[PDB]
Ligand binder design. Structure first.
Ligand code: BEF
Ligand SMILES: [Mg+2]
Length: 116
């Protein structure tokens, strides 16, 4: 089994992502903000972290930078409603950047790719 930490400030979106990823065969933990995400990730043993960007408190881009710095081989997907940050250099900390879509096929492909 692979374990994924799903980080997003919107509870109904956390819930949706948790359901979608459970269907693909993964075990899912969640965090509601960046600080919680870092606490969970550093103390835990995740295969992949999926990170929203816009959240109250530190942004997902800040979180991605910290994970990359303290876990060199971490697998990180930025999953955000907004394509704005794709050309943001902070986004370079992540392995993949996915804009949220109601069709989850693309996110699932990128997940399967990183968990190879
Ligand atoms: F609030 Be996330 F960047 F869609
Ligand atoms: Mg958000």
């Amino acid at each position: 089994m692979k374990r994924i930490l799903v980080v997003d400030d919107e509870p109904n979106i956390r819930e949706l992502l948790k359901e979608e990823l459970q269907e693909e065969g993964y075990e899912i933990d969640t965090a509601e903000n960046g600080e919680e995400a870092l606490k969970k990730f550093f103390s835990g043993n995740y295969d992949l972290v999926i990170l929203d960007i816009e959240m109250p408190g530190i942004s997902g881009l800040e979180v991605a930078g910290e994970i990359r710095k303290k876990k060199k081989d971490a697998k990180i997907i930025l999953l955000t409603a907004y394509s704005h940050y794709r050309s943001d250099m902070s986004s370079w900390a992540a392995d993949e950047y996915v804009v949220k879509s109601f069709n989850f096929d693309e996110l699932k492909e990128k997940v399967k790719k990183l968990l190879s």
